[PDB]
């Protein structure tokens, strides 16, 4: 879309630098079968189905981000959150930036029972609703300085029907792939629910949540080749 | 905005001592703060920066491994624990607040310092 | 590490005169230098930051100019109570380095 650097799944995720017009199309070819992000925080992908995400997205004809975040992420279940940042994300104004589909409600510190979150079609009337969430994890003396809980989190969404779980990892983390390169102590585990027309998504979550924002909406039939 | 530097005085070098910024006048868990030392005649000298949790800490060479930088955001406090000290850390000790609200919690959350203390002298001399 | 050769090391003008301090850096900052002055015996208030933005209530005749590896800081007009220490620093890596200062006194 006459922007630079930034890969189709890169523009999926909502990296800064990379929120951009998002044209229409009724033909779409599929370059990439392993979609690669070179940009925004290490993320570990094979965790999850993420990778198939912007090749989804190529398949409807009409594809757009929300405009508005679908909910907002400080006053959330679990005390009041700030909305986190990064260098490994650099925002052309700020040294720090961070995905604008996704929001890091870090507590301003004691374990916590999981938290339940729904989650609103606001997309309009027919088009289906990709919606990205995640967790972060770090080592355990950083769980500590972040959270009230070096133990591993539990995480679990449903929607559609499509009921999945999660449990965050402690240390040894792998190299980091596919980020902007600074050396970091955490790691990023990315996953993304669709919602059919009216239908609501559910997130029930622990320390180190990431709250989503922005939220696709996708309608029509794009030809893949 | 104000912020007091307090607990500088005479110490043995090697010994111990710990400072005490007591901030007020504006959310202190939203910003990062600073420490910087200026011994008498010559300049700035930049000792340590935590940010706005205790996560993360950065130290200037001189200083690393023997001085501690904590903050209680509760108390509204920000600390300095210096170990094994030496002749040349006597200075005068300012306290400084990072202007930018950044939850960088990566790196960069340190801007322009905009509020500075009156400091604390700290002469380290047997 | 980045060095922050300040330049000049100590001056002196009459009022009304422009004084000019300039910062150089070993390597690129961009934007993150930032300039204060020494009340004597008093701590520092902060005038520029970002290197050209002008804080709140500080005067018009203050004004800072640069960009990659060199900076300038200007006073159109020099005043007496403009009498200080005034000091670069960059914010651009981990390390924090400030420039060796400049004494600005009064020629009458």
């Known amino acids: 879309p006459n922007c630079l650097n930034c890969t189709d799944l890169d523009v999926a995720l909502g990296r800064p630098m990379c929120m951009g017009t998002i044209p229409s199309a009724k033909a779409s070819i599929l370059h990439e079968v392993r979609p690669v992000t070179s940009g925004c925080f290490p993320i570990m992908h094979d965790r999850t189905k993420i990778r198939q995400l912007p090749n989804l997205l190529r398949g409807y004809e009409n594809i757009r981000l929300s405009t508005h975040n679908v909910i907002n992420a400080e006053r959330a279940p679990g005390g009041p959150y700030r909305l986190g940042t990064s260098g490994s994300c650099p925002n052309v104004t700020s040294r720090n930036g961070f995905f604008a589909t996704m929001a890091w409600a870090v507590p301003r510190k004691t374990a916590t029972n999981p938290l339940t979150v729904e989650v609103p079609y606001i997309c309009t009337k027919g088009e289906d609703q990709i919606t990205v969430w995640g967790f972060h994890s770090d080592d355990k003396t950083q769980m500590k300085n972040l959270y009230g809980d070096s133990n591993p989190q539990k995480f679990t969404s449903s929607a559609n029907g499509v009921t999945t779980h999660y449990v965050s990892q402690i240390g040894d983390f792998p190299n980091q792939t596919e980020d902007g390169g600074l050396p970091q102590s955490g790691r990023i585990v990315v996953d993304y629910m669709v919602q059919k027309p009216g239908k609501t998504g559910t997130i029930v979550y622990q320390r180190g949540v990431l709250l989503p924002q922005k939220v696709w909406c996708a309608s029509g039939r794009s030809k893949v080749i | 905005v104000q912020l007091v530097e307090s607990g500088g005085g005479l110490v043995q070098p090697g010994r111990s001592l710990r400072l005490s910024c007591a901030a007020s006048?504006?959310?202190?868990?939203?910003?990062?703060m600073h420490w910087v030392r200026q011994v008498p005649g010559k300049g700035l000298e930049w000792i340590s920066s935590?940010?706005?949790?205790?996560?993360?800490?950065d130290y200037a060479g001189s200083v690393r491994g023997r001085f501690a930088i904590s903050r209680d955001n509760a108390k509204n406090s920000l600390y300095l624990q210096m170990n094994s000290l030496r002749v040349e850390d006597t200075a005068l000790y300012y306290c400084?607040?990072?202007?930018?609200?950044?939850?960088?919690?990566?790196?960069?959350?340190?801007?322009?310092?905009?509020?500075w203390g009156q400091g604390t002298t700290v002469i380290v001399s047997g | 590490d980045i060095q922050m050769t300040q330049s000049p090391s100590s001056l002196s003008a009459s009022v009304g005169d422009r004084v000019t301090i300039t910062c150089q850096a070993s390597?690129?900052?961009?934007?993150?230098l930032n300039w204060y002055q020494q009340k004597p015996g008093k701590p520092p208030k902060l005038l520029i930051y970002?290197?050209?933005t002008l804080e709140t209530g500080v005067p018009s005749r203050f004004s800072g100019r640069g960009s990659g590896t060199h900076f300038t800081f200007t006073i159109s007009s020099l005043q007496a109570e403009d009498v200080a220490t005034y000091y670069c620093?960059?914010?651009?890596?981990?390390?924090?380095?400030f420039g060796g200062g400049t004494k600005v006194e009064i020629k009458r």
């Open positions: 400084a607040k990072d202007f930018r609200s950044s939850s960088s919690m990566d790196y960069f959350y340190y801007y322009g310092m905009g509020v």
């Open positions: 006048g504006f959310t202190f868990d939203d910003f990062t």
């Open positions: 935590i940010n706005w949790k205790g996560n993360a800490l």
């Open positions: 390597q690129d900052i961009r934007q993150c």
């Open positions: 970002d290197a050209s």
């Open positions: 620093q960059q914010f651009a890596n981990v390390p924090l380095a």
